[PDB]
């Protein structure tokens, strides 16, 4: 005959943002040098 | 100077653009590095990244390309190699 009223509640939760990324690239530039440290005719005496 | 295509794995429209772009780059720059830089950047913009370009008078190469995105051609005595990979 005794009806008791009760109130229930569950705990809340917490989320968080995040990200993923594959490997990254970057540019590059090269110029080949053309040095010619060469004389005309060295008179050798080997 | 005169454009001569030796090999291509590329559509006809992109082939002509590659030559045209290199031709303009060769007109504007003397330094091969800067010519290559022009060609690469233009292709990334129009045909999506990532392109690579090598310009020079003396080299050999062995590279891997994505299908329909490789050309090798001469402008006079200067060879231009352009492709996508990555």
The CATH number linked to B62 is 3.30.740.10
Rounded to a whole number, what is the distance in Å from the CA of B51 to chain A's nearest CA?
Answer: 10
Report residue B13: phi and psi, to 5°.
Answer: -65, -45
Q: Which two tokens stand for residue B69?
A: 């995105």
Segments forming the whole domain that contains residue B78: 1-86
Could you tell me the resolution of this structure in angstroms? 3.9
Residue with tokens 């990555």: B86
> Taking CB atoms and an 8 Å limit, are A31 and B32 in contact across chains?
yes
Q: Is B55 helix (H, G, I), strand (E, B) or coil?
A: strand
Candidates B42, B43, B50, B47; CA nearest to B86 is: B50
Number of structural domains in chain B: 1
| CB B53 within 8 Å of CB B36 | yes
Cα distances from A40 to residues A34, A35, A37, A44, B53, in angstroms, run 17, 15, 10, 12, 36
Experimental method for this entry?
A: cryo-EM
> Taking CB atoms and an 8 Å limit, are A31 and B50 in contact across chains?
no
Q: Which of A26, A29, A33, A34 would you mutate first to test chain B, the one with the most B CBs within 10 A? A: A29
The length of chain B is 86
Rounded to a whole number, what is the distance in Å from the CA of B34 to chain A's nearest CA?
Answer: 9
């Amino acid at each position: 005959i005794r009806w008791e009223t009760k109130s229930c509640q569950t705990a809340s939760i917490a989320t968080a943002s995040a990200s993923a990324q594959a490997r990254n690239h970057v540019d590059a530039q090269v110029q080949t040098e053309a040095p010619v440290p060469v004389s005309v005719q060295p008179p050798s005496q080997y | 100077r005169k454009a001569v295509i030796k090999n291509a794995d590329m559509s006809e429209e992109m082939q002509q653009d590659s030559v045209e772009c290199a031709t303009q780059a060769l007109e504007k720059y003397n330094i091969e590095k800067d010519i290559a830089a022009h060609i690469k950047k233009e292709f990334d913009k129009k045909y999506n990244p990532t392109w690579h370009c090598i310009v020079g008078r003396n080299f050999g190469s062995y590279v891997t390309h994505e299908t329909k995105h490789f050309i090798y051609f001469y402008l006079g005595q200067v060879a231009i190699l352009l492709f996508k990979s990555g």
